[PDB]
């Protein structure tokens, strides 16, 4: 299984809605600094998932009108992403929040800030990973 171009951008026809799943698989580069997965709406970023190896954290935020909101960094366990290690991310959309799992295990919830779900119809992946598969 080869790799996707990076950054990878694709429309999510029909946008989001409860029960909608977006799956991604790949491998973190050996000396990755950071990588991100964005769910966008027009010129806004409804959900920014940003694992950071320099900061050993997983940052989540929303960018509306070019303004980043309050970051969410809480984690129930140790940073699951590891340099040079393969991973899978499952983003499940629900009515009030996005539920995110990493390597088959729930990691966190992110309450919707941009609530018009159908308008969130673009996926962007960028950063220090080798993207091997996407399921929208
Ligand atoms: C720790 C932190 O909040 N880091 C963000 C940084 O904050 C400033 C400052 O506001 C803060 O008080 C201080 C505390 O130590 O740290 C920094 O000096 O601000 C930058 C720029 O907004 C953030 O980086 C951006 O984060 C976005 C998601 O929130 C997105 O990933 C951008 O790509 C990234 O540049 C720091 O996360
Ligand atoms: Ni496929």
Swiss-Prot record:
Span of domain Galectin: 8-136
Residues binding a beta-D-galactoside 2: 48, 52, 62, 68-74
Protein location: Cytoplasm; Nucleus; Secreted
Stated induction or repression of this protein's expression: By toll-like receptor ligands zymosan (TLR2 ligand), polyinosinic:polycytidylic acid (poly I:C) (TLR3 ligand) and lipopolysaccharides (LPS) (TLR4 ligand) and by pro-inflammatory cytokines IFNG, TNFA, IL1A and IL1B in mesenchymal stromal cells. By IFNG in macrophages. Up-regulated in dendritic cells following infection with dengue virus. Up-regulated in Kupffer cells following infection with hepatitis C virus. Up-regulated in plasma following infection with HIV-1.
Tissue: Peripheral blood leukocytes and lymphatic tissues. Expressed in lung, liver, breast and kidney with higher levels in tumor endothelial cells than normal endothelium (at protein level). Expressed in trophoblast cells in decidua and placenta in pregnancy (at protein level). Isoform 2 is the most abundant isoform expressed in endothelial cells. Upon endothelial cell activation isoform 2 expression decreases while expression of isoform 3 and isoform 5 increases. Isoform 4 decreases in pathological pregnancy.
Job of this protein: Binds galactosides. Has high affinity for the Forssman pentasaccharide. Ligand for HAVCR2/TIM3. Binding to HAVCR2 induces T-helper type 1 lymphocyte (Th1) death. Also stimulates bactericidal activity in infected macrophages by causing macrophage activation and IL1B secretion which restricts intracellular bacterial growth. Ligand for P4HB; the interaction retains P4HB at the cell surface of Th2 T-helper cells, increasing disulfide reductase activity at the plasma membrane, altering the plasma membrane redox state and enhancing cell migration.
Subunit: Monomer.
Entry domain remark: Contains two homologous but distinct carbohydrate-binding domains.
Protein's name in the database: Galectin-9
Organism taxonomic ancestry: Eukaryota, Metazoa, Chordata, Craniata, Vertebrata
Underlying gene: LGALS9
């Amino acid at each position: 299984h080869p790799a996707y171009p990076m950054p990878f951008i694709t429309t999510i026809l029909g946008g989001l809605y409860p029960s909608k799943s977006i799956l991604l698989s790949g491998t973190v580069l050996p000396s990755a600094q950071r990588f991100h997965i964005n769910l966008c709406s027009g010129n806004h970023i409804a959900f920014h998932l940003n694992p950071r190896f320099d900061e050993n954290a997983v940052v989540r935020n929303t960018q509306i009108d070019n303004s980043w909101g309050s970051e969410e960094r809480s984690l129930p366990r140790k940073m699951p992403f590891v340099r040079g290690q393969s991973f899978s991310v499952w983003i499940l959309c629900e009515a009030h929040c996005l539920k995110v799992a990493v390597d088959g295990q729930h990691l966190f919830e992110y309450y919707h800030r941009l609530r018009n779900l159908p308008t969130i119809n673009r996926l962007e992946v960028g950063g220090d990973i080798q993207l091997t598969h996407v399921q929208t």
